[PDB]
Amino acid sequence: LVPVYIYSPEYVSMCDSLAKIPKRASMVHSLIEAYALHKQMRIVKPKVASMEEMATFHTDAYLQHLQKVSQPDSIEYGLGYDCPATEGIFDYAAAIGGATITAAQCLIDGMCKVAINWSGGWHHAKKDEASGFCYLNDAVLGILRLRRKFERILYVDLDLHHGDGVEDAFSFTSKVMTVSLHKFSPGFFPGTGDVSDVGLGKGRYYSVNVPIQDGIQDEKYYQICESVLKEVYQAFNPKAVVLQLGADTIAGDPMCSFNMTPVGIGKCLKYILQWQLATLILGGGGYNLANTARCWTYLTGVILGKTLSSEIPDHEFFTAYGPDYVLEITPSCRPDRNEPHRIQQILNYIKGNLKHVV
Ligand SMILES: O=C(CCCCCCC(=O)Nc1ccccc1)NO
Ligand SMILES: [Zn+2]
């Protein structure tokens, strides 16, 4: 009845080797270890995602190319600047999926109410192509696995970016719903998913997308979140939840767009949690490394329902939390360019869309 925490040194170190965020998992796990919160969770070692296990969603050519490469044909398979070809990513990606699959497996074995995989949450990678630092849509692998025991699954995406890859995969079906809350403005990755984009075919209206602009703090974010999800849950009536809790919305992230504190996102986490559903907790974006570790450290708190010591404790990465050495984050002071006009104009458009589900 206690939460499953996906950890191993071998995993964490694989996850530190992803170029675009060196030492982030180390840091994350470390601040958590430091607050001793891992001792209040069942630590589960993640399995290696088998060639087939990954092939559930990723077209086998890809998963074969990415293996040779990890030991010319790189530009085909979506690799680029965003996604280097570091020998060897094949194991890196195969550890994130495996972790997310392991977490989902616990949930479906009845091992826990909640499973955590901070290292996962790569909501961009497509079936045949890498995109957005994402090599492997581990959420998709998480949801697919969850779909063996549970009927209706709900993906909620609270990362700064659009969960496009998760949206894509389940845009056709009505058996999975995606709520993504993100920035929308052209040029800004991935530049898919305006409110209008709602899912196609047998699963039309089964894709929510909330476009938001810079400046938004907790107060207003919880509003849009508590709103949407309330109407989504009542309508969709899901059997399990998959949460992507990207850190790049938070103040101090060099991506400097939203203005969240972990408290605000944690209020949303508190909300989703009260549903007493099976819940898969994934990370995502996080580019202020300390703020990220602060953030997911915090969140593990609310999952465990344990309020945390404000003073950061000493450990490996203590120095990173200076100068003020605390868990809380101060919002930056800059305009909330979300006119309260357009917000209500967005709720309705969504609210009316939910009158169709299902
Ligand atoms: O945050 C993410 C993945 C990030 C992918 C967005 C692309 C941003 C990017 O590549 N910008 C950049 C590249 C090099 C240096 C500075 C910014 N998931 O939501
Ligand atoms: Zn992001």
Curated annotation (Swiss-Prot):
Pfam families recorded: Hist_deacetyl
Class in the EC hierarchy, top level: hydrolase
Residues involved in a divalent metal cation binding: 159, 161, 248
Result of changing residue 26 to E: Decreases the deacetylase activity
Documented EC number(s): 3.5.1.98, 3.5.1.-
Catalytic reaction list: N(6)-acetyl-L-lysyl-[histone] + H2O = L-lysyl-[histone] + acetate; N(6)-acetyl-L-lysyl-[protein] + H2O = L-lysyl-[protein] + acetate; N(6)-(2E)-butenoyl-L-lysyl-[protein] + H2O = (2E)-2-butenoate + L-lysyl-[protein]
Protein name (Swiss-Prot/TrEMBL): Histone deacetylase 8
Protein source organism: Homo sapiens
Gene behind this protein: HDAC8
